[PDB]
Amino acid sequence: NIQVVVRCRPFNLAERKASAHSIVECDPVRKEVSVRTGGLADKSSRKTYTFDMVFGASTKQIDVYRSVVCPILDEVIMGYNCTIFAYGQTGTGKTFTMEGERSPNEEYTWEEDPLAGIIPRTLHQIFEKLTDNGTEFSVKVSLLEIYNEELFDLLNPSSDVSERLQMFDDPRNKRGVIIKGLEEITVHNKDEVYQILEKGAAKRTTAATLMNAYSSRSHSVFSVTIHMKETTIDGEELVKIGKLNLVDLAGSENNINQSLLTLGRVITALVERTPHVPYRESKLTRILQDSLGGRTRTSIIATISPASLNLEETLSTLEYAHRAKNILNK
Numbered sequence: 001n002i003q004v005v006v007r008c009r010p011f012n013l014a015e016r017k018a019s020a021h022s023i024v025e026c027d028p029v030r031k032e033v034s035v036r037t038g039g040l041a042d043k044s045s046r047k048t049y050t051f052d053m054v055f056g057a058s059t060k061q062i063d064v065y066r067s068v069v070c071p072i073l074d075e076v077i078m079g080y081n082c083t084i085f086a087y088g089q090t091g092t093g094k095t096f097t098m099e100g101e102r103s104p105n106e107e108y109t110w111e112e113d114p115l116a117g118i119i120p121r122t123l124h125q126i127f128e129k130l131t132d133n134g135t136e137f138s139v140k141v142s143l144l145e146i147y148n149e150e151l152f153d154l155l156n157p158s159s160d161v162s163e164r165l166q167m168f169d170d171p172r173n174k175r176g177v178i179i180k181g182l183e184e185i186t187v188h189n190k191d192e193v194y195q196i197l198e199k200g201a202a203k204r205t206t207a208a209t210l211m212n213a214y215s216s217r218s219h220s221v222f223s224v225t226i227h228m229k230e231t232t233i234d235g236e237e238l239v240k241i242g243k244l245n246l247v248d249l250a251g252s253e254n255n256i257n258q259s260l261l262t263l264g265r266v267i268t269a270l271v272e273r274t275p276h277v278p279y280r281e282s283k284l285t286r287i288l289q290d291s292l293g294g295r296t297r298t299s300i301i302a303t304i305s306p307a308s309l310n311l312e313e314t315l316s317t318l319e320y321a322h323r324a325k326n327i328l329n330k
């Protein structure tokens with residue numbers, strides 16, 4: 001049930017001038033990724049995995065959005081909850097897939113930058129889709145980050161990153177939590193998206209100087225809630241509420257990361273049908289527990305490197321992502 005896709009990033013400039021041989025080969029039509037495990041392009045041993053979708057190095061942001069994100073966004077707009085995880089070693093493209101970057105020299109506007117990732121495109125498409133049709137709606141976003149089992153709000157513009165948030169169980173709905181003081185920024189229109197994202201980037205920079213390896217060791221959860229009151233061309237009123245969580249996981253390479261540690265164990269118990277799932281043993285898994293064997297539709301995008309140097313880690317990732325496929329929810 002949980003759909004997992006693989007995305008291989010392309011060799012960087014440093015690897016180009018050093019003329020690197022890729023140990024990774026993708027086959028989109030056959031949903032397969034093959035990895036050279038022994039060495040030699042003339043003769044070798046290989047490991048092969050089949051996932052729900054595979055994207056090779058030539059894949060652009062647009063392909064990933066039209067393929068994986070558009071159908072999920074549609075489900076969200078119907079009143080469902082969806083989650084998308086980016087999993088993989090640091091430097092493989094987890095942030096590039098989820099957030100994206102800017103094209104050099106101000107060549108484009110944030111709405112047309114071909115380097116934009118899932119988060120900017122989605123906020124732009126929500127307004128694009130709901131504004132056209134006759135629908136009343138409000139968009140709220142939120143950016144929760146976890147570092148060393150502490151919670152931080154990266155969008156509140158009246159608090160510094162030295163102020164952690166408190167987490168309690170929600171006495172109302174089970175297996176849910178309440179984050180005291182978490183801010184929800186209302187995005188009144190498409191032309192209000194970029195700055196909210198800019199604010200989070202700046203505050204995140206203060207976070208990095210205050211915590212070691214912050215961007216490598218932290219988990220970020222960018223949430224977008226959509227309150228909708230649709231009115232068909234007839235006069236029917238549809239009040240749907242959708243929530244989409246975009247999670248940029250800590251680097252999977254191996255102090256301790258309890259949330260990452262617990263995520264691997266939660267997945268294990270779910271796939272092996274173990275009665276006890278260790279959701280509560282980490283902030284990340286308590287927060288997103290409905291996205292792991294719950295009533296949420298979730299997708300995992302595993303990012304890998306094609307360089308032979310990252311062999312051990314590329315396999316860990318694939319192998320980790322291949323087991324997640326057996327997780328069933330709803």
Ligand SMILES: Nc1ncnc2c1ncn2[C@@H]1O[C@H](COP(=O)(O)OP(=O)(O)O)[C@@H](O)[C@H]1O
Binds near residue numbers: 010012089090092101
């Ligand atoms: N699919 C891709 N296309 C072009 N460049 C990419 C791609 N994936 C990663 N990169 C580049 O690789 C480097 C690793 O980036 P990053 O996304 O921040 O890694 P991570 O978040 O997994 O630690 C960046 O300089 C980025 O521009």
Ligand SMILES: N[C@H](C(=O)N1CC(c2cc(F)ccc2F)=C[C@H]1c1ccccc1)C1CC1
Binds near residue numbers: 099
């Ligand atoms: N460096 C910046 C940047 O590229 N980004 C900031 C960003 C981002 C930052 C967050 F906190 C939370 C979610 C996000 F998605 C992603 C990108 C982006 C945004 C729009 C188009 C292309 C790429 C910009 C804002 C200054």
Ligand SMILES: [Mg+2]
Binds near residue numbers: 091094215
């Ligand atoms: Mg990163």
